[PDB]
Amino acid sequence: SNFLNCYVSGFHPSDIEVDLLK
Amino acid sequence: SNFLNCYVSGFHPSDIEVDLLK
Amino acid sequence: SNFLNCYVSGFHPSDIEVDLLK
Amino acid sequence: SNFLNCYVSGFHPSDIEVDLLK
């Protein structure tokens, strides 16, 4: 349902838990 | 229904919790 | 009826962000 | 158009996870 995921530039550390039912 | 995940740049370690359920 | 997960650098050192199960 | 995982970094380390439709 209109899934728009954009990510620019990465990294080594940090924790990102992205969760989308769609 | 309509979702945009705009994430850019990094940084030191941390706890990023993102959850989209609609 | 439209989620816009945005984030460009910054963020404070902790465990947060934004979550909604509804 | 529905699937837009615009990714540009390759950062494999850290805690990165995307729940594409669970």
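qc> Chains C and D do not touch (no CB pair under 8 Å).
qc> done
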